[PDB]
Design a protein around this ligand. Structure first.
Ligand SMILES: [Mg+2]
Length: 86
C-alpha cells in the first residue's frame, strides 16, 4: 500500500541495464519498507571484481535506492554460473 518500489520495478531496472541471462528477485519487503535479494547472471559483470559488480547493480536502481530498506545480491557472469553448475 502506497509503495512505488516493487519487485517488478527492480526487475525492470535490472533487466534494462544488465540484460541478464538469468534473474531471480526475492521480495523481502517487511516492516521497514521495500527490500529485495537479487540473484543476477549478466555478461555486464565480465572483467569486473565483486565490488565493481555491486556498483553496477546499484547504479541500475539508483533512483529507487532511497526507498529501499535493504538490497542484497549475488552477481555472476554467465561463465561463472555455468561453472558453479547454475
Ligand atoms: Mg536501504
Amino acid at each position: 500500500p502506497g509503495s512505488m518500489v516493487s519487485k517488478s520495478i527492480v526487475e525492470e531496472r535490472l533487466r534494462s541495464m544488465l540484460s541478464p541471462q538469468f534473474l531471480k528477485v526475492t521480495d523481502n519487503s517487511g516492516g521497514c519498507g521495500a527490500a529485495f535479494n537479487a540473484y543476477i547472471v549478466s555478461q555486464q559483470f565480465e572483467g569486473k571484481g565483486l565490488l565493481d559488480r555491486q556498483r553496477l547493480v546499484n547504479s541500475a536502481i539508483a533512483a529507487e535506492m532511497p526507498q529501499i530498506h535493504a538490497f542484497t545480491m549475488k552477481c555472476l557472469t554467465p561463465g561463472e554460473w555455468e561453472a558453479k553448475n547454475r
